[PDB]
Amino acid sequence: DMDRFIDALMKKMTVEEKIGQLNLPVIAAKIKRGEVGGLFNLKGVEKIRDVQKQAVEQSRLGIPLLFGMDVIHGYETMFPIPLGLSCTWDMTAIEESARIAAIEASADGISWTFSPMVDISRDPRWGRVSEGSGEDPFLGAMIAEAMVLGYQGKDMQRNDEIMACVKHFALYGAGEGGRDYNTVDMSRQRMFNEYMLPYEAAVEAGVGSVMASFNEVDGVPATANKWLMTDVLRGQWGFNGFVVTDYTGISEMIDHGIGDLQTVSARAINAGVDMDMVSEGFVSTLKKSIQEGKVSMETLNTACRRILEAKYKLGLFDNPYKYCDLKRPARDIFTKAHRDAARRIAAESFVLLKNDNVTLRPGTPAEPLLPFNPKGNIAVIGPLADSRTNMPGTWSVAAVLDRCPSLVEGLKEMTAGKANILYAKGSNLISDASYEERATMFGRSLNRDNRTDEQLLNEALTVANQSDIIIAALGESSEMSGESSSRTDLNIPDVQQNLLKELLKTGKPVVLVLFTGRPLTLTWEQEHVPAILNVWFGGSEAAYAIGDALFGYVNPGGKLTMSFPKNVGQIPLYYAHKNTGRPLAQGKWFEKFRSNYLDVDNEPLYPFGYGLSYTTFSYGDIDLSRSTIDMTGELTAAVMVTNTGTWPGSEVVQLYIRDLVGSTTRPVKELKGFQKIFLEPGQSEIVRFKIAPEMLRYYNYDLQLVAEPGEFEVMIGTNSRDVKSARFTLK
Amino acid sequence: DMDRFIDALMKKMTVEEKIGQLNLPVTGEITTGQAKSSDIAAKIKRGEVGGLFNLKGVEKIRDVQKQAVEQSRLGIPLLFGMDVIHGYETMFPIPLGLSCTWDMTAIEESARIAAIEASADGISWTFSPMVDISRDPRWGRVSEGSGEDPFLGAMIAEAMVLGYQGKDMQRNDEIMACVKHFALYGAGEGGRDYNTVDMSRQRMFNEYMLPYEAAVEAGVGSVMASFNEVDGVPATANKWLMTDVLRGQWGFNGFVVTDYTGISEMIDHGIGDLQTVSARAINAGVDMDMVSEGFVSTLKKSIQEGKVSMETLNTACRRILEAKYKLGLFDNPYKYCDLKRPARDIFTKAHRDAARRIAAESFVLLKNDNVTLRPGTPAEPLLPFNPKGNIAVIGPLADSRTNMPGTWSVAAVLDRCPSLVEGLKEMTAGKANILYAKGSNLISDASYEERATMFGRSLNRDNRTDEQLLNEALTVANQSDIIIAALGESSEMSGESSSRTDLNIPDVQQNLLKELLKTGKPVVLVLFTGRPLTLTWEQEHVPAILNVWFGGSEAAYAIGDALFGYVNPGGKLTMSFPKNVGQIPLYYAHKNTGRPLAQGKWFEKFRSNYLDVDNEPLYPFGYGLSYTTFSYGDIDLSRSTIDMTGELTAAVMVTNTGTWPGSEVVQLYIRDLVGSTTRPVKELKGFQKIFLEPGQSEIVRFKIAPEMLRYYNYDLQLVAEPGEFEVMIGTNSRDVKSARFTLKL
Ligand SMILES: [Mg+2]
Ligand SMILES: [Mg+2]
């Protein structure tokens, strides 16, 4: 068993060797000296197996390395960016995507992924919303569990299972101004009720590791916050794994302004940080701090033991080359089977935001543009129409970017012999050249040239006037989101929106195929464009998935997981908000002396849980099996859902609960369940949710997790806004 | 003594009479909320009323006080309250504008004058000062406060309280003040009034609380509970706030009043029914119920049921009686009911002359670039200029009397204030011709204009086309020697329940501005606003920009004073002006983060920065220009190391290097370089407003002591830690000279 093996190995180690287990650089001589616990961002089973060999046969002790990577939404087969993927509301598919990424990464030497990212954000200015699962902790928690299980399985003993790492602990999504890395501040009550659940869910799913965040919390960088890294993570949640820093998290505490490298390195290990990514703080200062009494041998031994336990649980002491089978890449990476799964999941992720009836043929009743049969001349226009490299999304560091089909390429393939795909670039990404350069970093160039926006527009209008339909492929480049990609404006960029306006003016039907890593401010587009399909960034097979949706091979069933505001001046806008003492009643905007603005109502353009279908669904009234239950009781909430349109399709039936009165103020609703159903036209299904007091608990003023007696409102519907309602009492 | 008198009075009182002292109905003509009261005369007779508010006029107040004194069983006199915010009838600048004077003597003076006028007319109690810290210029109530900084906020709070109350409120021209809104109301989410507030305890104490504490320590007689929740509890039910901090920590001896229907609004907040939330309020330390009738209609039942004790009720009642006693109302119920005072104390020339001086002192010169007026002559700034020829005054703020005083002017006579055109015409009679055109409406949307001009601020929008308005303005402009573009907000685009998601000069006004600039005539933007605006376009394109906020009843004259060079602008901003609303919140006293963007390095991947704009406000905290220029020598520190017992002096020579006499606000900032928690990159810890003649120099000296270096650490201990400090002095928070020193144990 483990405790004896590790007891025995640690009794053999020098202090330098114990310190070395805590070092994660991004070398050959360091491994020989036992100064390396793991490496990251090394790609290829060949390079990795050879680094493992050195560790195993050329260090005094032969301790095997962990090999890490940001395997975030795929290894080479790229699934949608996590924010897009969350809109599937499909935990089975989400688990599957993680399973596949693990199969591919493990095939190539990787034993550890820095995933899932589970940070709640209510602030769409932050580029890293693309990396998460939206604004809601219940859904965030369910996804956290699905991802951990996908990567790790039961117990990481299979050679196609790897160690997951829940990040970024904690509260990194609340950075002020939506500006990445910026100050975070909130009450403890808000932390636990509104931000913490997804981290806790990952811990409770058995996640092997946790990554400490860049932000301060209560004026202490998270990487030195003992309350977080020990008292909450271990003391409250019983986490048995290890904590890694984010990239140079330790030395960045110097800039944060809490001390010199020795001081913050000591504070980090004393807080419960076990492994040091890149900074070399632990390696270069811990011996000196042990000599001065600033860090005890107990503390060092604990950190070391945790690293060794992780290696042992991965089976690395049984076999250092568990994940170095040179025959696996050919069998496991970028296979048709995997790519087909990615295409299926990508189509499932898209959110149909609008699909109004349009007058297509003179005299006929108006009908929607989507879906359409692939025939005639199909214009595909815009700076996202013919880019391979922008398809997979940000966070695709192992992807072969220029191997992904562009939208034009994929639609060409899918329509060959049936329709002509007519391309025009239409516009640059944005007017400002310098902006375009930074927005297309990391190999995402759109090959901007000397052609002016007027030139590009004119060419596009010529093409558009040759066509029967216009697919406007517009929005963000993939690197307008991700890390260090914060925006103060959330529009479709200037020249693209002008292009869109001019395309509409041709009188040809226009479908907006929107690429984005985040919520955008879309009021103009909602007013003027007949059809809006949010495709996020769908991964390496996005082009094919988009064709599937456009041509009706798949009926869109995605639902938003983050509010879409009308303007940046409404931020933060989130569905699970408090009522205030002066709530504006529905339809009363504007009212003086209510909580409202002079210039816009309080509502998002599209709420949490919003998404349309090529069919329609109708909800009957809610049946509650009980009108009252006590602290040990239960009841069932039941609703009949009917497919009332002409298309087979899926619906995400959403369960919300409002605690009407609290000892503290409670949100106007909270997601507490969901079921994704598939119905043929005319078919009905009674959807049942079990409601029990465990679900009704919340962190009160004293941070006691309790359900208080009183009345609750149960709401069920197609999104967080449009719901059927019923009430019951807890005694 | 007071205790004996109050003991005796309380011995006579029924439970209903003690409950009645906690009740504050609304009456009169002033509207500051939705709910209205009824049956007040009979309620007073029954002893069910402790005070009233929104009643204006000494004759009306005297009649009502005579009903209280002569016709209730016990004759207990009423408090009479009003929002006397920046003036009674003689109106000073809106508080946010006034804060830009950086002149505590003038601020105190303005409060003194307001107290003299209000007290002359029956008022014993003002709901002032508002001291809420805000970093969010979307919020309309930034107009009512003193900006984003707690040090300056605290000094202003003291100045206002002292101005209203004096030493002890004994004089008949002294009134009770009420610090509001306790607490954290300026941090409402989205900048949307009344919305959720949430923050850490450390943030509360380091960043938000000091101004409330300063008012308490100045002896403020009352505190107003805020509308927002704090830690999930409406402030009106928050016992930690209203008891533990206010009384427990700060030793407040006065009483707590709610804001307007604050108690019944807790039902909406979602913490229970009227009885439950009223019981919670009084148990928390709330003593007086504004309008809701929570206390009067439910406390007896709660007392019968054991939800509120007799000791709790007695304590709340005693606090109200103590307030009345300290104001001298038991000695003389009619102290403030001198029917002959209004004719001699209100809206006098002396008061109005002071308001005119203080208004000119409040303006902030944001830009004043050289312009070539005529070939062969070197370029000069447009401001100041001699009044001569044809001076155009154009825009929707050009000829509006009622928009001059600003929001929260509930007792002002709005249509008596001169418009800008009227004032400039008076000031230039026989010297220049004042030409006028409205030029544009306030904003394209007529429904918005209506709600923005409520409370008697109509601009008299007509059915003229934008074409008619613009063409008339262009005909004026093309005959004019200079154009005064009087643009910006209407007064009620700020104040309560006036939040904006866009902070531009409104559409049709900005279009007007573009067209005026296109004439090629020289254009001065005289900008009216209650809040920071997003002015990047204007800073690029307009030669001269004078921020006049809302100057009060004499604003038009003060504006003439500045334009014509009778006064040299010396105002400095007290709140950051963002480049766009996507940067909110911007504030100068911010943490470094772990990935600070080095100066001049925008854009850098993997630093804390945005893709589309740099991190900086257009105009930083403390920003303001003059008709002259000031230069700063290097800082001289008297020693480089001190201990906790010591002190040092930071000195710098400031020289007037320009051609005009004028004032400079010399600002002291300190950075605690290393902390056990992260510390702001700077914090204002002092200032001195100096006046220099051209060529004159002055050595400005600041005492720096360890007491100034304290902050609330992780454990909320108010401590100074040993280590390095950076002393910064300069003309605003951005442009500073630096020196370093060490603090030791
Ligand atoms: Mg309840
Ligand atoms: Mg220090």
Report whether A203 contacts A171 (CB < 8 A): no
Q: How many helices (DSSP H) and strands (DSSP E) are in chain B? A: 22, 29
Report whether B721 contacts B700 (CB < 8 A): no
* Choice among B259, B345, B399, B561 that is catalytic: B259
Q: Label the pairing between strands B636-637 and A376-381.
A: unpaired
Nearest to B611 by CA among A701, A329, A483, A379: A483
Q: Label the pairing between strands B482-488 and A112-113.
A: unpaired
Report whether A278 contacts A248 (CB < 8 A): yes
For chain B, the 3-state helix, strand and coil shares in percent, each to the nearest 5, are 35, 20, 45
Residues A330-335: contacts with CB under 8 Å, at least 24 apart:
A331/A107, A332/A103, A332/A104, A332/A106, A332/A107, A332/A160, A333/A75, A333/A76, A333/A77, A333/A104, A333/A107, A333/A108, A334/A76, A334/A77, A334/A104, A334/A400, A335/A77
Counting ligands in written order, the one closest to the CA of B271 is 1
Residues in B closer than 8 angstroms to A665, CB to CB, are 229, 232-234, 269-271
The minimum CA-CA distance between B2 and chain A, rounded to whole Å, is: 38
CB distance from B582 to chain A under 8 Å?
A: yes
Cβ of A189 and B607 within 8 Å? no
Token pair recorded at residue A568? 């940046």
Whole-angstrom Cα distance, residue B367 to residue B385? 15
The topology under which CATH files domain B348-629 is Rossmann fold (3.40.50)
CA B11: distance to chain centroid?
42
Whole-angstrom Cα distance, residue B356 to residue B557? 7
Whole-angstrom Cα distance, residue A474 to residue A384? 6
Q: Label the pairing between strands A628-629 and A376-381.
A: unpaired
Q: Which residues contact B310 (CB under 8 A, 6 or more apart)?
A: B303
Report whether B92 contacts B98 (CB < 8 A): yes
Report whether A718 contacts A654 (CB < 8 A): yes
Please name the amino acid found at residue B369: D
Please name the amino acid found at residue B154: A
Report whether B723 contacts B615 (CB < 8 A): no
Question: What is the Cα gyration radius of chain A?
Answer: 26
> What backbone phi and psi angles, to 5 degrees, belong to B130?
-85, 120
Token pair recorded at residue A731? 């005694």
The minimum CA-CA distance between A527 and chain B, rounded to whole Å, is: 18
Evaluated on CA atoms A202, A208, A214, A219, the torsion sign reads positive
Nearest to A174 by CA among A184, A164, A187, A165: A184
Whole-angstrom Cα distance, residue B523 to residue B186? 35
Q: Which residue has the tokens 């000599």?
A: A291
Report whether A494 contacts A500 (CB < 8 A): no
DSSP-based three-state secondary structure for A398:
coil
Burial grade of A16 (CB within 10 A; 0-12, 13-18, 19 or more) = middle
The torsion region of residue A378 among left (phi > 0), alpha (psi -120 to 50) and beta comes to: beta
Q: Which residues contact B414 (CB under 8 A, 6 or more apart)?
A: B401, B402, B405, B456, B457
Nearest to B582 by CA among B527, B525, B542, B536: B536
What are the Cα distances from residue A374, in Å, to A347, A471, A615?
A: 17, 12, 20
Counting ligands in written order, the one closest to the CA of A657 is 1
**Could you give the count of Cα atoms lying within 13 Å of A565 in the half-sphere of its Cβ?**
22
Whole-angstrom Cα distance, residue A139 to residue B565? 64
Q: Label the pairing between strands A710-717 and A649-659.
A: antiparallel
Q: Which residues contact B442 (CB under 8 A, 6 or more apart)?
A: B396, B448, B449, B452, B453, B459, B461, B490, B506, B508, B509
Report whether B702 contacts B686 (CB < 8 A): yes
Respond yes or no: is residue B132 known to be catalytic.
no
Report whether A347 contacts A548 (CB < 8 A): yes
A661 annotated ligand-binding residue: yes
The minimum CA-CA distance between B486 and chain A, rounded to whole Å, is: 22
Give B713's DSSP letter: -
What residues does each domain of chain A span? 1-334, 335-616, 617-731
CB distance from A186 to chain B under 8 Å?
A: yes
The dotted CATH code for B630-745 is 2.60.40.10
CA B162: distance to chain centroid?
16
Q: Is the bond leading into A221 cis (omega within 30 degrees of zero)?
A: no
Whole-angstrom Cα distance, residue A321 to residue A340? 30
CB distance from B36 to chain A under 8 Å?
A: no
CATH homologous superfamily of domain A1-334? Glycoside hydrolase, family 3, N-terminal domain (3.20.20.300)
Looking at A206-339, which runs of residues are DSSP E strands?
209-212, 216-217, 220-221, 242-244, 276-277
> What backbone phi and psi angles, to 5 degrees, belong to A456?
-60, -40
> What backbone phi and psi angles, to 5 degrees, belong to A234?
-90, -55
Report whether A132 contacts A667 (CB < 8 A): no
Token pair recorded at residue B519? 């004439």
Counting ligands in written order, the one closest to the CA of A697 is 1
Q: What is the DSSP string of B631-690?
A: EE---EES-SEEETT--EEEEEEEEE-SSS-EEEEEEEEEEE-S-SS---S-EEEEEEEE
Token pair recorded at residue A276? 């040091």
Looking at B477-587, which runs of residues are DSSP E strands?
482-488, 523-528, 544-549
One fold for B348-629 and B630-745: no
Strand partners, B152: none
Q: Which residues contact B367 (CB under 8 A, 6 or more apart)?
A: B539, B542, B543, B544, B545, B625
Looking at A79-183, which runs of residues are DSSP E strands?
112-113, 165-169
Report whether B532 contacts B585 (CB < 8 A): no
Strand partners, A211: A244
CA of A661 from ligand 1 middle (Å) equals 4
Residues in A closer than 8 angstroms to B493, CB to CB, are 598
3-state secondary structure B225-275: ECCCEECCEEHHHCHHHHHHHHHHHCCCCCEEECCCCCCCHHHHHCCCCHH
For chain A, the 3-state helix, strand and coil shares in percent, each to the nearest 5, are 35, 20, 45
Evaluated on CA atoms B317, B323, B326, B330, the torsion sign reads negative
Evaluated on CA atoms B343, B349, B351, B352, the torsion sign reads positive
Cβ of A249 and B594 within 8 Å? yes
Cα angle A346, A350, A356; round to 5 = 150
Please name the amino acid found at residue B161: V
User: Which uninterrupted H or E stretch holds A624?
Assistant: strand A623-624
CB distance from B449 to chain A under 8 Å?
A: no
The minimum CA-CA distance between A420 and chain B, rounded to whole Å, is: 37
Named by the residue before each, gaps in chain B exceeding 2.5 A from C to N are none
CB distance from B234 to chain A under 8 Å?
A: yes
Whole-angstrom Cα distance, residue B734 to residue B619? 9
Residues A412-417: contacts with CB under 8 Å, at least 24 apart:
A413/A544, A414/A374, A414/A544, A414/A547, A414/A551, A415/A374, A415/A378, A415/A547
Cβ of B609 and A484 within 8 Å? yes
Q: Label the pairing between strands A510-515 and A531-536.
A: parallel
Q: Label the pairing between strands B711-712 and B662-672.
A: unpaired
CA B188: distance to chain centroid?
17
What are the Cα distances from residue B76, in Å, to A267, B12, B67, B72, B165?
A: 62, 12, 10, 7, 22
Instruction: Give Dmax over CA atoms of chain A in angstroms.
Output: 88
Give B89's DSSP letter: S
Nearest to A422 by CA among A386, A379, A387: A379
* Choice among A70, A180, A246, A548 that is catalytic: A246
Whole-angstrom Cα distance, residue B48 to residue B515? 61
Q: Which residue has the tokens 């000892």?
A: A663
Cβ of A186 and B200 within 8 Å? yes
In chain B, which residue's Cα lies nearest the Cα of A702? B231
Please name the amino acid found at residue B68: A
Counting ligands in written order, the one closest to the CA of A693 is 1
Strand partners, B664: B690
Report whether B683 contacts B670 (CB < 8 A): yes
Whole-angstrom Cα distance, residue B144 to residue B316? 29
3-state secondary structure A308-351: HHHHHHCCCCCCCCCCCCCCHHHHHCCCHHHHHHHHHHHHHHCE
Whole-angstrom Cα distance, residue A526 to residue A727? 35
Cα angle B578, B582, B585; round to 5 = 60
Give the architecture-level CATH label for domain B1-347: Alpha-Beta Barrel (3.20)
What are the Cα distances from residue B22, in Å, to B69, B217, B257?
A: 17, 24, 9
Q: Which residues contact B124 (CB under 8 A, 6 or more apart)?
A: B79, B80, B81, B175, B176, B327, B329, B335, B336
> What backbone phi and psi angles, to 5 degrees, belong to B577?
-105, 110
What are the Cα distances from residue B732, in Å, to B116, B267, B590?
A: 35, 45, 16
Whole-angstrom Cα distance, residue A691 to residue A688? 10
Whole-angstrom Cα distance, residue A151 to residue A95? 8
Give the architecture-level CATH label for domain A335-616: 3-Layer(aba) Sandwich (3.40)
Nearest to B181 by CA among B236, B249, B131: B131
Q: Which residues contact A117 (CB under 8 A, 6 or more apart)?
A: A72, A82, A128, A131, A132, A167, A168
CATH homologous superfamily of domain A617-731? Immunoglobulins (2.60.40.10)
Whole-angstrom Cα distance, residue A149 to residue A116? 11
Report whether B477 contacts B519 (CB < 8 A): yes
Interface of B with A in 478-507 (CB under 8 A): 493, 496-503
Report whether B271 contacts B310 (CB < 8 A): no
3-state secondary structure A536-605: ECCCCCHHHHHHHHHCCCCCCCCCCCCCECCCHHHCCCCCCCECCCCCCCCCCCCCCCCCCECCCCCCCC
Helices B555-563 & B349-362 angle (0-180, nearest 10): 50
Give A380's DSSP letter: E
Cβ atoms within 10 Å, residue A717 = 21
Nearest to B732 by CA among B617, B653, B651: B617
Cβ atoms within 10 Å, residue A673 = 20
Whole-angstrom Cα distance, residue B285 to residue B279? 10
Q: Label the pairing between strands A376-381 and A419-424.
A: parallel
Please name the amino acid found at residue B299: L
Cβ atoms within 10 Å, residue B11 = 7
CB distance from A181 to chain B under 8 Å?
A: yes
Token pair recorded at residue B470? 């613009």
Token pair recorded at residue A524? 């103009």
Q: Is the bond leading into A214 cis (omega within 30 degrees of zero)?
A: no
The minimum CA-CA distance between A548 and chain B, rounded to whole Å, is: 33
Report whether A668 contacts A713 (CB < 8 A): no
Resolution (in Å) of the shown entry? 1.6
Nearest to A598 by CA among A569, A640, A628, A556: A569
In chain A, which residue's Cα lies nearest the Cα of B721? A258
Report whether A67 contacts A55 (CB < 8 A): no
Whole-angstrom Cα distance, residue A432 to residue A436? 6
3-state secondary structure B568-587: CCCCCCCCCECCCHHHCCCC
Report whether B295 contacts B19 (CB < 8 A): yes
Residues in B closer than 8 angstroms to A270, CB to CB, are none
Q: Which residues contact A317 (CB under 8 A, 6 or more apart)?
A: A5, A64, A311
User: Obtained via which technique?
Assistant: X-ray
CB distance from A443 to chain B under 8 Å?
A: no
Residues in B closer than 8 angstroms to A177, CB to CB, are 582-586
Report whether B463 contacts A532 (CB < 8 A): no
Q: Label the pairing between strands A220-221 and A216-217.
A: antiparallel
User: Which uninterrupted H or E stretch holds A256?
Assistant: helix A252-256
User: Which uninterrupted H or E stretch holds B112?
Assistant: helix B104-120
DSSP-based three-state secondary structure for A531:
strand
CA of A449 from ligand 2 middle (Å) equals 52
What are the Cα distances from residue A521, in Å, to A491, A500, A524, B153?
A: 5, 15, 8, 36
